[PDB]
Amino acid sequence: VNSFSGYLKLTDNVYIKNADIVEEAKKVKPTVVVNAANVYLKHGGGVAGALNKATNNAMQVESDDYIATNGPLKVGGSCVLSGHNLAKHCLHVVGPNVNKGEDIQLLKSAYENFNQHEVLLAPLLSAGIFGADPIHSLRVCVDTVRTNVYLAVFDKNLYDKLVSSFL
Ligand SMILES: O=C1CC[C@H](Nc2ncnc3[nH]c4cc(F)ccc4c23)C(=O)N1
């Protein structure tokens, strides 16, 4: 039993809700919140910009030190950093950005990072400003993640479409 509330159950392990991931994280304080990161951990917009703003830019400060030490992530890769005031940990995961020409096949590799964590609050990878089809992202999530994932979808219209079209 966990503290997530109001989710629709899609499969044995995947749950979905129309919610602002920032507000959901502040309420649940999950062990792991997933950020829709880029390889530079520059949290400018989309989910990343919103999560970073909610930390009063502390996420960005921590991230800049991480990059100065380690260099950029790989597309499809991840790193674990602090969750600040939102969660115990933040798993920064880099899905391919279609608006940069990156290979959508890397979306499965990106979701594989979730399997290192028993329970996660997460957005749909590569959705929103990353330019992929969110219906496809949900399919890859369900077919790749085996741990318990609670998906927050900000847009109510998109949420209804994701549910109604789910196979
Ligand atoms: O760009 C996108 C849009 C679709 C989906 N985004 C989100 N998912 C969940 N909660 C969210 N809260 C936000 C707060 C913001 F200010 C901006 C974006 C989001 C957002 C995604 O995957 N990427």
Side-chain angles (χ1 to χ4, degrees):
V1 178
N2 61 51
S3 165
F4 289 101
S5 180
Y7 286 75
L8 179 70
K9 179 171 179 62
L10 294 177
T11 67
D12 181 68
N13 62 302
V14 180
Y15 293 81
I16 194 167
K17 183 180 177 180
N18 172 221
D20 184 342
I21 192 172
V22 169
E23 287 307 307
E24 186 77 5
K26 284 196 286 187
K27 157 174 119 55
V28 175
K29 287 296 234 82
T31 305
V32 179
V33 66
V34 174
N35 182 32
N38 59 57
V39 297
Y40 306 110
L41 302 179
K42 287 172 61 92
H43 308 302
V47 169
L51 290 171
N52 177 58
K53 184 177 167 182
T55 76
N56 183 44
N57 211 51
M59 178 180 286
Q60 191 64 67
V61 171
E62 178 194 31
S63 294
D64 288 349
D65 170 84
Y66 173 92
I67 296 286
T69 297
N70 300 109
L73 296 181
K74 299 169 181 180
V75 179
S78 71
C79 67
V80 179
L81 291 173
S82 179
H84 301 276
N85 52 318
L86 305 176
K88 188 174 192 300
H89 304 106
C90 179
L91 181 70
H92 295 273
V93 180
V94 184
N97 188 324
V98 174
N99 304 318
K100 300 181 181 177
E102 292 165 354
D103 175 15
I104 195 60
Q105 296 300 128
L106 290 169
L107 187 54
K108 187 174 185 75
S109 301
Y111 274 117
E112 287 171 342
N113 295 285
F114 289 24
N115 289 322
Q116 300 293 317
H117 303 277
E118 286 191 358
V119 182
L120 315 87
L121 171 62
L124 285 170
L125 298 179
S126 298
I129 69 178
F130 281 63
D133 177 358
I135 297 180
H136 174 65
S137 182
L138 178 54
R139 188 74 258 165
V140 177
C141 180
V142 161
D143 293 342
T144 305
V145 182
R146 299 177 300 283
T147 55
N148 292 143
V149 56
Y150 290 85
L151 295 168
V153 176
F154 180 57
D155 189 74
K156 170 62 172 170
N157 287 324
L158 173 60
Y159 170 85
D160 286 346
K161 179 194 193 115
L162 285 165
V163 167
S164 291
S165 61
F166 183 71
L167 225 196

